[PDB]
Amino acid sequence: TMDEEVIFETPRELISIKRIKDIPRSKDTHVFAACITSDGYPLIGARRTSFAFQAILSQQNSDSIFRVSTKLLRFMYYNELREIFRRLRKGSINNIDPHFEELILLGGKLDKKESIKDCLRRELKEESDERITVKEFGNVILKLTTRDKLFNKVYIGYCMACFINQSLEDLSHTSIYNVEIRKIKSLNDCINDDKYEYLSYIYNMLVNS
Numbered sequence: 001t002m003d004e005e006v007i008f009e010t011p012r013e014l015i016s017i018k019r020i021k022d023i024p025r026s027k028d029t030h031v032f033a034a035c036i037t038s039d040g041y042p043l044i045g046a047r048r049t050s051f052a053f054q055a056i057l058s059q060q061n062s063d064s065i066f067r068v069s070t071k072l073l074r075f076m077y078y079n080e081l082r083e084i085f086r087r088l089r090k091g092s093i094n095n096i097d098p099h100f101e102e103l104i105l106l107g108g109k110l111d112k113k114e115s116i117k118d119c120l121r122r123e124l125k126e127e128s129d130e131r132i133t134v135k136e137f138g139n140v141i142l143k144l145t146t147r148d149k150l151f152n153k154v155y156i157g158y159c160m161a162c163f164i165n166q167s168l169e170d171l172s173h174t175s176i177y178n179v180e181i182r183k184i185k186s187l188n189d190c191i192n193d194d195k196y197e198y199l200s201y202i203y204n205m206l207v208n209s
């Protein structure tokens with residue numbers, strides 16, 4: 001409902017999802033697009049760089065010293081793990097998840113002279129290599145408040161439904177090339193992901209209300 005706030009917990013995140021009426025236009029506003037394809041599939045992106053590896057890189061401060069929490073190893077991509085251990089090359093490493101992917105809703109920063117819908121259109125364009133267009137926007141607006149339990153940071157974002165012109169196959173035959181997204185896929189192919197429950201909830205709330 002317009003009232004209800006729902007809090008999900010994962011091993012990595014706590015997220016509050018609350019229906020609101022208007023998005024507070026300002027400096028740091030993220031707008032996320034929950035995309036439904038023409039043939040009715042919910043979309044999800046795999047972030048190009050994991051949150052874990054981004055954090056790790058930002059924590060370095062020396063030419064001759066590289067520093068990494070082992071707990072983060074299970075939350076990184078193959079190429080990232082390779083980059084970390086490429087020089088040391090020990091026999092093997094532990095705590096790896098070969099099925100890891102960083103699931104994210106598409107979308108981005110609201111710019112100064114920009115409406116919400118224009119922002120959604122533009123960001124969906126940039127993150128899909130010009131392959132996503134919006135036929136119709138939903139009317140339900142959600143506020144997402146995320147605490148990252150690993151890094152102790154809180155993030156705010158706002159989500160809307162985007163019914164796009166493309167089909168699932170339209171976005172799943174050619175690989176993504178831009179710097180933000182490494183893959184666009186059906187959320188329903190991600191049932192075992194840590195984020196699947198709350199993401200599925202976001203889609204269901206946006207379409208079944």
Ligand SMILES: C[n+]1cn([C@@H]2O[C@H](COP(=O)(O)OP(=O)(O)O)[C@@H](O)[C@H]2O)c2nc(N)[nH]c(=O)c21
Pocket residue numbers: 012013030051052054055146147148151155156157
């Ligand atoms: C760095 N980072 C970004 N996000 C999410 O991604 C959204 C974008 O946050 P951003 O870092 O400002 O943009 P970017 O992802 O393009 O760099 C945030 O509102 C958060 O929802 C993040 N979410 C978690 N759980 N942990 C993180 O480290 C993290």
Ligand SMILES: [Mg+2]
Pocket residue numbers: none
């Ligand atoms: Mg960032």
Ligand SMILES: [Mg+2]
Pocket residue numbers: 107108109123126127180
């Ligand atoms: Mg973007």
Ligand code: NA
Pocket residue numbers: 089090091
């Ligand atoms: Na080796």
